[PDB]
Amino acid sequence: MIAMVSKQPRKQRKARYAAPLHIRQKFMGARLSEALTKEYGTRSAAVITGDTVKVMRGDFKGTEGKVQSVSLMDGTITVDGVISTKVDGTEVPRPLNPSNVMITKLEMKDGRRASSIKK
């Protein structure tokens, strides 16, 4: 969150860079699918490790997979199937920005998830 109090690039980027962890949680937001947005009443939600998302920008547009990992400090997610093959030949996962993906299936093992997404 950064209000129109400060329209200065220095203050916006400082706020993003020194955002606390509870604010970096909100940086993991991604667009919900049409069904999910209709059945939740919100347009976006935070990507969580486990739920299925479709990558819609980058080299891996259209791939659906489960979030393997989430780094809040990096602001990145790790999705099943989104990998870079390294000079060894072994496959490392390529971190993605959550704004480049779209949630298609939500993980609902946590009862707090509904109010987490909205309200």
Q: Please give the residue ranges that form the binding site for RNA (CB under 7 A).
A: 1-14, 16-17, 21-22, 25-32, 43-44, 46-49, 57-60, 67, 69-73, 75, 84-89, 92, 94-100, 110, 112-113, 115-117
* Residue matched to tokens 């400082």: 14
Q: What DSSP element (H or E) covers 116?
A: helix 113-117
CA 19 to chain centre: 16
Nearest to 104 by CA among 51, 60, 58: 51
> Quick one: 39 or 57, whose CB is closer to RNA?
57
Nearest distance in Å: CB 32, RNA: 7
**Contacts of another protein in 3-42 (CB under 8 A):** 7-10
